[PDB]
UniProtKB/Swiss-Prot annotation, chain B:
Keywords for the protein's UniProt record, in alphabetical order: Acetylation, ATP-binding, Chaperone, Coiled coil, Cytoplasm, Isopeptide bond, Nucleotide-binding, Nucleus, Phosphoprotein, Repeat, Stress response, Ubl conjugation
Similarity section: Belongs to the ClpA/ClpB family.
Positions that bind ATP 2: G318, L319, S320, G321, S322, G323, K324, T325
Free-text note on domains in this protein's UniProt record: Has 2 AAA ATPase type nucleotide-binding domains (NBDs) per monomer, a low-affinity, high-turnover site (NBD1) and a high-affinity site (NBD2) with a 300-fold slower rate of hydrolysis. There is allosteric regulation between the 2 sites. ATP binding to NBD1 triggers binding of polypeptides and stimulates ATP hydrolysis at NBD2. Nucleotide binding to NBD2 is crucial for oligomerization.
Gene designation: HSP104
Name of the protein in question: Heat shock protein 104
Chain sites annotated for binding ATP 1: G47, E48, P49, G50, I51, G52, K53, T54
Length: 705, 574
């Protein structure tokens, strides 16, 4: 009701300003058909929130407004609302269901198939059971008029678990999400609306590609949203970029104030006589002159900028009318083409893209407008992402592919020879990333045999190479219980049963870092409930969780960990591994998890025992390692005796099992506090070196000064 | 309290905007046997929800308002005033019963001879065994008049059906799943007014269809609801389409749930089972006998001699040649078009003939979880799955015997009780250990002596009822040399589609010489039989990656290129 505040937009949607959402029609179409059901017409769609969704309803509402239908159907109109508004927005306490009572006959009085509705409101259910309009729910069926709300997947079950007849008296469909790519066509088609807001040019592919890693780099904004954010944030980095010449606003303006005050302040002044006026004249000369070169020039930017914004307003203009022009179709066929002819457009756009054409055509020196007003390919986006994330063009500029092709040589540079192990995975990964597995099939493998082995780091670094991430990390306890994984995996409380928790490492962030690291651990470890989930967890297209009840497996990375090389390691007498040792290795677990999983296995391949010409390098990192990052150059010194020094601790370095991992800690701590010592007094503060000398094992080492 | 939550109906029957749907009249007549029925004045009716249990009670009113029936009870109160008035009485606590007590006087002493009806007995009595709905109900029920509820069975209802206030009170008389033929007589009687208010016009034969088909295959949504949907689903397309048939209304539905109706609309059954059979030949060659062995009770499946509850299946001989376990399920899918069928149970934990760990495992009496959640759930999931077995069963003979139950006969010994069925469930125990005797092969085929004996050695191995009934056989000569080879094109045509064939139409070429080299090596004597897939993909997938890397070419290609000497290194150029 008016007081009940029809959100009817079919008026503004008669005015049609909020614009044609696309793509779910077929659903909607049929859903609309469902919404026409002889028996119960009230489904819903459920899933991730916000975003294109009521827009569907709107888009629905559009096709609704779009008339032609089965007879009953355009015998409808709508509204929407909040009682959330009308909560106190109607009256004093007790009025939850209140105005429905009006609504009842308000519906039932003379009224055609007009349907208000609001979405999760149908939840009602602040807590427990509201049921007010659920009282009306049959009274709806009594009222014999559709209304539909909308929630996620999440709610209604519990609700229908509480209600039963609810969807028993209803239907559903569900969010499919837009088509990743083709989403953009809309988004493309969104521009003409959306551009005009802050009118500029647009380069497509960026936006698209933007959307990609927008989605990629920021998944958790839903397929439109993130773009919508781009879409937004586009306009953002655009926005002040549409401040006229913000730098050249204040920059050259100064030339006034520079020479301005002295136009008089020299007129009277204590200086050499008449040279005061000379400097008063000669700078005012350059004030007069130098002004001029930009003096019309800055405007003719802004002028023609206006000329843009002029035409931009025609751009603004055209559609408005065109909208309105096509609303006169609601004037039936009377004013359908009549006005639609009057608006012409042979030219109205032949106006447009030929108008700002020239000033786009004319490049000042280059690039035409420093307004640049257009898609700025990443940039903005980079910046966007930056403002979201940071880290540069490397992070921001890439192809797959190109991003990928070299990774090994990097990855090589990351840890160990493992060229194969690299290569295999690399490929496997590359080959993953290729025509890939489809999200359903995941990507995983395993090494073995040693700690201090960096394959984590590798992967970790790969994730960097993938995701820039050492950020995305997973630590999978397995052995730590057989009855485990309440916490770790889905269980926790997966029923909403008691004391809700679940996916303890996992579910919590599992989803929210869709982009995958993941682990398995040292051996068969504790428990088959791995096999349970690791089935799914490996199983192609795994979708489960607590109460979200979904893995959505797209980014597919665990590979995993496990090892037993005990003999095999020590068995191995040389850098490269002895043949069939592996085979000897094979049966070890592969008996456990068995061909089903052995198949289910993508593959698993392990690390050598790579020793020393290795370590001859490997040590190298540690120096560079810190230094490579360290700080950003406090003083930041090269400081090395290198193969002299390093070896000699590398001599200490290799722990057998652990290598210098301790020494990692134990290298520098040596060198370090001396740094403070070499921070203090009587020092030499440049980049220096190490000292190394020799008890038998007790060895001078230390540092220059 | 008078009309508020009430279903004022008999008028809407007496004025009759109700649309008669005339179902099973007996339980009504049975229900009619209430009118003066005393000791237990009423029965009940237990369906699953969607069945019009009250539409009955509605139809009852049609049996009523139309009168010329027993007027022993003549004046009427039929109307259910509960709704949610339970909590929905007022702004505070205590009035629920008032909410009915506020009903009591405006329902006070009966002039109108007719007992009314409230929904469930569990819509009755609110939660159940609660003051809500005047928990104790002689005084009115033995009193002014009565009412009726109704629900589905056991547990919640059973608890109060044992004693409570029903200690003296109603039985339950339960219409069936809507039966065979009437359902169109239903449907066609449903036609005129429902179809008259639905759209266009209409003709029979399609009406038959989903009727069968909802009846078919569709335990969930068995009710015409889907047809009733198909009804609206019908006008859905065309009435739209006309705004600007074939049961293909049902099609897209049958597309919706099946994934194509050409899967559902499809081989009818029996010839087509045999066409299925020959299509399984079309699937995988190898022992036609194996096929034919597998072909045996195919016809016996669903047809029945003594029961469909007969398990019909083709007892497996454990080994894996080609279709083996896999296509055995694929055909099992290719039965129902549904690949998913049944999982495998690891028998590792099953080692003894007993454990708390069993396909049932727990009885669900005391704390724990359900072991073998499969048939716990897999039927809650699904009818007619495949099954799961092992060449050494490490399973518990307990269940094996408890499934020798379901083994020999059809209905399986439901641990929690509820052999919901064995109807289409036809699957074969897969075991053999005789690999080294299985190792006895020469040429493409084996003459049977061994195949009697380790057989025999097994025939008595695990005790006979296992090996007693359930004929058909599974035989392994493997592939000889090539014949399997064709799997490659499969293996090929396994590629393109999985994601989109669009990705690569490039379709390449297999250079049999390689495929030889591939196969000959690539899969073991024994099996070693998976990986070349897992493998040859790769080095190719390299080129894939590769030729996708610097990316000069796009085409549809034929690879056919190849050179320890164990590698002549296939590859492919632009
Ligand atoms: N032409 C279009 N085609 C497709 N989607 C569109 C189009 N125009 C706008 N949208 C989407 O519509 C949404 C804006 O409408 P919304 O208000 O978000 O619908 P909704 O309210 O988000 O659904 P709810 O109520 O939020 S759960 C954004 O996600 C846009 O991506
Ligand atoms: N360049 C390197 N090459 C190999 N291993 C390295 C390298 N740098 C560090 N590591 C160590 O490798 C380990 C990283 O985990 P992994 O890749 O699993 O190898 P891992 O050593 O078996 O795992 P750990 O040692 O049990 S944490 C850590 O012990 C790191 O210190
Ligand atoms: N010939 C018939 N006789 C009796 N009932 C019928 C007949 N045809 C259809 N119905 C039922 O009438 C019902 C009308 O809708 P509802 O009763 O609200 O749904 P329902 O679940 O079937 O009813 P319940 O739960 O069984 S009381 C349909 O659901 C049909 O199951
Ligand atoms: N045409 C085929 N030729 C060979 N194997 C096939 C073929 N089609 C399916 N399979 C196999 O079917 C298997 C599933 O059934 P199983 O009988 O358990 O096989 P298996 O016992 O793992 O030993 P395999 O299959 O001979 S390596 C998969 O492992 C596939 O290798």
């Amino acid at each position: 009701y008016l007081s009940k505040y029809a959100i009817d937009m079919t008026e503004q949607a008669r005015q049609g300003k909020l614009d044609p959402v696309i793509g779910r029609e077929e659903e909607i179409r049929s859903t609309i058909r469902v919404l026409a059901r002889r028996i119960k017409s009230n489904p819903c769609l459920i899933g991730e929130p916000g975003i294109g969704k009521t827009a569907i309803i709107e888009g629905v509402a559009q096709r609704i407004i779009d008339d032609d239908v089965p007879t009953i159907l355009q015998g409808a109109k709508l509204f929407s609302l909040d009682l959330a508004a009308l909560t106190a927005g109607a009256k004093y306490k007790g009025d939850f269901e209140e105005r429905f009572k009006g609504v009842l006959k308000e519906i039932e009085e003379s009224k055609t198939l007009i349907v208000l509705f609001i979405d999760e409101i149908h939840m009602l259910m602040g807590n427990g059971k509201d049921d007010a309009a659920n009282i009306l729910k049959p009274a709806l069926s009594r009222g014999q008029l559709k209304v539909i709300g909308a929630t996620t997947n999440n709610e209604y079950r519990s609700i229908v678990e509480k209600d039963g007849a609810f969807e028993r008296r209803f239907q559903k469909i569900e969010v499919a999400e837009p088509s990743v790519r083709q989403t953009v066509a809309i988004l493309r088609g969104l521009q003409p609306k959306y551009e005009i807001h802050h009118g500029v040019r647009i380069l497509d592919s960026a936006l698209v590609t933007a959307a990609q890693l927008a989605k990629r780099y920021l998944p958790y904004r839903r397929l439109p949203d993130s773009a919508l954010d781009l879409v937004d944030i586009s306009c953002a980095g655009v926005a002040v970029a549409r401040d006229s010449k913000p730098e050249e606003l204040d920059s050259k303006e100064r030339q006034l104030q520079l020479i301005q005050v002295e136009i008089k302040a020299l007129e009277r002044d204590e200086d050499a006589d008449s040279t005061t006026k000379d400097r008063l004249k000669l700078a005012r000369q350059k004030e007069a002159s130098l002004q001029e070169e930009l003096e019309p020039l800055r405007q003719r930017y802004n002028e023609e900028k206006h000329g843009h914004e002029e035409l931009t307003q025609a751009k603004k203009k055209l559609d408005e009318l065109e909208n309105k022009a096509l609303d006169a179709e609601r004037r039936y066929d009377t004013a359908t083409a009549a006005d639609l002819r009057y608006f012409a457009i042979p030219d109205i756009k032949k106006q447009i893209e030929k108008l700002e054409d020239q000033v786009a055509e004319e490049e000042r020196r280059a690039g035409a407008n420093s307004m640049i007003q257009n898609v700025v390919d990443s940039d903005t986006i980079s910046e966007t992402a930056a403002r979201l994330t940071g880290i540069p063009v490397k992070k921001l500029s890439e192809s797959e592919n190109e991003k990928l092709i070299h990774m090994e040589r990097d990855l090589s540079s990351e840890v160990v020879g493992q060229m194969d192990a690299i290569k295999a995975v690399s490929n496997a990964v590359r080959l993953s990333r290729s025509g890939l597995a489809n999200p359903r099939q995941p990507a995983s493998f395993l090494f073995l045999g040693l700690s201090g082995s960096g394959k984590t780091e590798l992967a970790k670094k790969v994730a960097g190479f993938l995701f820039n991430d050492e950020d995305m990390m997973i630590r999978v306890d397995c052995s730590e219980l057989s009855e485990k994984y309440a916490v770790s995996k889905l269980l926790g409380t997966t029923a909403g049963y008691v004391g809700y928790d679940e996916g303890g490492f996992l579910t919590n962030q599992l989803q929210y870092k869709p982009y995958s690291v993941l682990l398995f651990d040292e051996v068969e470890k504790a428990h088959p409930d791995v096999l349970t989930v690791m089935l799914q967890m490996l199983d192609d297209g795994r979708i489960t969780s607590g109460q979200g009840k979904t893995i959505d497996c797209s980014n597919c990375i665990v590979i995993m960990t496990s090892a037993l090389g005990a003999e095999f390691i020590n068995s191995q007498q040389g850098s490269k591994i002895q043949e069939s040792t592996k085979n000897l290795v094979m049966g070890a677990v592969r008996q456990h998890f068995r061909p089903e999983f052995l198949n289910r296995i993508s593959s698993i391949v392990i690390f050598n025992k790579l020793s020393r010409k290795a370590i001859h390098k490997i040590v190298d990192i540690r120096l560079k390692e810190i230094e490579e990052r360290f700080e950003q150059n406090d003083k930041h010194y090269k400081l090395n005796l290198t193969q002299e020094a390093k070896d000699f601790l590398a001599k200490y370095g290799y722990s057998d099992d652990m290598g210098a991992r301790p020494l990692n800690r134990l290298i520098q701590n040596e060198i370090l506090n001396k740094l403070a010592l070499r921070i203090l007094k009587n020092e030499i503060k440049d980049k220096e070196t190490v000292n190394v000398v020799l008890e038998a094992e007790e060895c001078l080492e230390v540092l220059p000064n």
